Symmetry: C3
Subunit: 93 residues, 3 copies
């Protein structure tokens, strides 16, 4: 029941930070950041984990993928994509 | 059972417009626009509302967030992110 | 139970390729590509299909929309948006 906002680009850097919105309280709070800065990142939820797929870290388009476990507040890197992808769409089916 | 397309960038302006697709009829129709133009916007659905998170309005990267109620066809602004984020990934967990 | 990564931009071209992640095996595999290269594409899942909405193909911002049927491994084009939209957010409600 939370909305997670993962990465992106502010007016100054590509972001590794992640924040979560609680609609009951109308508040966002920062949680554990990604391993890598990622804008243009695709995000999906599968088996209670949040996957962050691809993006751009300021230095290169990314093929890496990492998964967030809310029960532990940590991200871990998993198998990368076949190709670097920023501006990627992600869905779970 | 509708697909909402929120904001974006055409070949001429960043967009505040929003349109909804009905697969039964293979048609898109325009609904109420966002308060702000937003490309690179993250969108998620929680408690029957559509949240539009961050993006870019042509003038600045955005920390603002707004929520759409389909029963009223209106968007309203809620608490902003801690940081401006365009190219942000959003998921609900 | 798979995560699909649709389109995007590598360090060399806008992408029509699509790959699917199986968390049980920690592997991605390439499936049928989109009709069009699409970065900045919005993706959502409705009635067992994956919709790819808008984006950019290297030549132009896109109003086209296509839908993937995993049982047939094919994409087909459906009704386009009213407006070209890349950097578009997409959700299903």
């Amino acid at each position: 029941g939370l909305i997670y906002a993962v990465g992106g680009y502010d007016g100054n850097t590509h972001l590794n930070s992640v924040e979560a919105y609680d609609p009951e309280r109308n508040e966002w709070s920062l949680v554990a950041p990604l391993s890598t800065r990622r804008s243009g990142v695709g995000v999906a939820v599968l088996n209670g984990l949040i996957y962050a797929v691809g993006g751009y870290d300021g230095n290169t388009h990314l093929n890496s993928v990492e998964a967030y476990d809310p029960e532990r507040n940590e991200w871990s890197l998993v198998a990368p994509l076949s190709t670097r992808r920023s501006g990627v769409g992600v869905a779970v089916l």
